[PDB]
Write a protein that binds this ligand. Structure first.
Ligand SMILES: O=C(O)CNC(=O)C(=O)O
Ligand SMILES: [Cl-]
Ligand SMILES: [Mn+2]
Ligand SMILES: [Mn+2]
Ligand SMILES: [Zn+2]
Length: 455
């Protein structure tokens, strides 16, 4: 009555033939899983990456977490615990909370107890957790090249499901990006304890996310399919409007804990799963997800973008602009970078990039005609990729400029995208300059190179 568990998400058990290539597999399970938002992947029994670490030499600074529903939390972005001392803290917490041996507590009990304690205004439970990019003080759980590796570790060095390799595997379009997006293309490490949770969110630029539980007690997930993303946001906007005020920057995104039953009440489809050790969880583009840890564990997650994502990546940047939210990178700069590397691209990748570039060129053509009719006559080429991102964001909608922007001598250093020409300054239009990366005559050959590559 208190908590009705959402239905279970799809669970996939691929064979070795299927499991070999992750990108082919994901593209194969996409019709099913994009209807549920999240899905679980059980690797073949023989696939078992070795986990070896010294629990005494791995430290990390813990993050503190209050467990209150609808309360605002800042999203994690870019004394200490050793992994042993944290684990002793975590196990003692759960053991004392339930007065039971940590592993005799049912996962469904912890679930209903989590949703009890977060709604109860009386309870003041705070927990700690670890969340960070791999460093010298705390490295990846997967094998990496560096030290002498055992023959079994060498098996999994070049694996596709080694989340260190997934970003740069040449089917992830995030691989050829040279701009700094370290918080996006590098794996995150999550050290969890009982009730430690991650609030409702989607990935930056609506990218995929893949999560591997190396070891420990399960991680409980809740997922919402991408098509219901705005349904969920409406439900949340009503209950918690505090989360939807304009963010000063990217380090100030507000997220929250909210009961799935509340979403299911408003006809938002929600799915759940328990991710156990050695299992993958995959979230699809714009699929909202949240959850909590059943106890002491260690997870590793990374974002990635396939060819299927490219159109969504464009729609997302459009949506970011409507909301005046900062981008992590320029979508167009990425597209043009791949166009300039057409000869070395995968041919299916080149085909998809071409289609997106065709749309980009069509839009840019229309926008430049529009600003010309606004009086902007003067123009000059400008290498936007050389500018730090904070120096090339639209004054109005905060979008990162690459294809074009408008500048004015009256307001030096300031820029606006071509959607917000009126927002630059109070000077007449002939004082404006169109700053462009490419002429339309530069762009069509670039697209042609993609077409030839894709045959
Ligand atoms: O494991 C966590 O704490 C949170 N993980 C994610 O949000 C993800 O893998 O996409
Ligand atoms: Cl509470
Ligand atoms: Mn996530
Ligand atoms: Mn506007
Ligand atoms: Zn703008």
């Amino acid at each position: 009555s208190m908590f009705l568990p959402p239905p279970e998400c799809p669970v996939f058990e691929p064979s070795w033939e299927e499991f070999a290539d992750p990108f082919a597999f994901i593209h194969k399970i996409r019709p099913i899983a994009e209807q549920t938002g999240i899905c679980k992947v059980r690797p073949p029994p023989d696939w078992q990456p070795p986990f070896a670490c010294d629990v005494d030499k791995l430290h990390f600074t813990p993050r503190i977490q209050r467990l209150n529903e609808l309360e605002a939390q800042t999203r994690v972005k870019l004394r200490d615990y050793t992994l042993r001392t944290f684990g002793e803290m975590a196990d003692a917490f759960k053991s004392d909370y339930f007065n039971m041996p940590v592993h005799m507590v049912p996962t469904e009990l912890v679930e209903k107890e989590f949703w009890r304690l977060v709604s109860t205004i009386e309870e003041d439970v705070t927990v700690e957790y670890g969340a960070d990019i791999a460093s010298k003080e705390f490295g990846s759980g997967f094998p990496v090249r560096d030290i002498k590796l055992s023959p079994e570790e060498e098996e999994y060095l070049d694996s596709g499901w080694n989340l260190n390799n997934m970003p740069v595997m040449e089917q992830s379009v995030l691989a050829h990006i040279t701009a700094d997006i370290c918080g996006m293309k590098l794996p995150w490490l999550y050290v969890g304890m009982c009730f430690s949770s991650f609030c409702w969110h989607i990935e930056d630029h609506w990218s995929y996310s893949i999560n591997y539980l190396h070891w420990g007690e399960p991680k409980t997930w809740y997922g919402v399919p991408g098509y219901a993303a705005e349904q969920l946001e409406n439900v949340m906007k009503k209950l918690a409007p505090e989360l939807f005020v304009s963010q000063p920057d990217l380090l100030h995104q507000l997220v929250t804990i909210m009961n799935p039953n509340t979403l299911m009440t408003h006809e938002v489809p929600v799915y759940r799963t328990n991710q156990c050790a050695g299992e993958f969880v995959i979230t699809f583009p714009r699929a909202y997800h949240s959850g909590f840890n059943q106890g002491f564990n260690f997870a590793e997650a990374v974002n990635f973008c396939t060819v299927d994502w490219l159109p969504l990546g464009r729609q997302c940047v459009e949506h970011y602009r409507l909301l005046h939210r900062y981008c992590v990178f320029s979508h167009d700069e990425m597209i043009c970078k791949m166009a300039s590397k057409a000869d070395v691209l995968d041919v299916v990748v080149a085909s998809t990039v071409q289609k997106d570039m065709a749309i980009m060129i069509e839009d840019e053509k229309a926008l430049r005609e529009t600003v010309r009719k606004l009086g902007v006559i003067d123009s000059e080429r400008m290498d936007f990729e050389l500018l730090p991102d904070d120096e090339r964001q639209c004054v109005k909608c905060k979008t990162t400029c690459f294809m074009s922007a408008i500048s004015c001598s009256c307001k030096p250093g300031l820029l606006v995208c071509l959607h917000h020409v009126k927002e630059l300054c109070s000077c007449p239009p002939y004082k404006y300059k169109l700053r462009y990366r490419y002429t339309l005559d530069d762009l069509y050959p670039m697209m042609n190179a993609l077409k030839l590559r894709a045959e």
